[PDB]
Amino acid sequence: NLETYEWYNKSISRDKAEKLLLDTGKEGAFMVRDSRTPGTYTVSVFTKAIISENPCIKHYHIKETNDSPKRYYVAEKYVFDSIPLLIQYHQYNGGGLVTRLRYPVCGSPGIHRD
Numbered sequence: 001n002l003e004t005y006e007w008y009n010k011s012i013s014r015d016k017a018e019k020l021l022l023d024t025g026k027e028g029a030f031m032v033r034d035s036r037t038p039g040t041y042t043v044s045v046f047t048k049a050i051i052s053e054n055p056c057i058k059h060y061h062i063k064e065t066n067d068s069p070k071r072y073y074v075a076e077k078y079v080f081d082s083i084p085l086l087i088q089y090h091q092y093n094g095g096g097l098v099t100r101l102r103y104p105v106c107g108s109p110g111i112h113r114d
Contacts, residue, residue, distance in 0.1 A: 002032070009033045014044075018057045021046040032062070039064040043074070049098070060096060 002008040009017065009031045021029050021044060029046040041062040048055040065071040076096040080086035087101060094100040106113075 005032075007032050014042075014059070017044050021057050022055070035061065039070075058096075 007030060012033055017031055017033055027048060031044050033042050035042045043060040045058050047058060050056055061075050061077045062072055063075045090097060090101045
């Protein structure tokens, strides 16, 4: 039933998804494909934001809930035992985020670092 939408690419591999999206060269070119577990999908989007030798294809998970009937949401591929560990992770890896967490700020008034 997803098969009736232009963006649904069912079976295709990550690598050919990336090739197809790169070739378009259009900002916000995208495709939905299938993920490892059923009920889970993957959005893949072309972007020229982060010049780090442009461009990038971002991949997102679409998880489902345990509802009646069922709901869907965009989330990262990962869960963490701890918020600090989830933060730790995102200092070194962008993940589902635009930039990754380089610099904590404390907003207690009159406070400064080191």
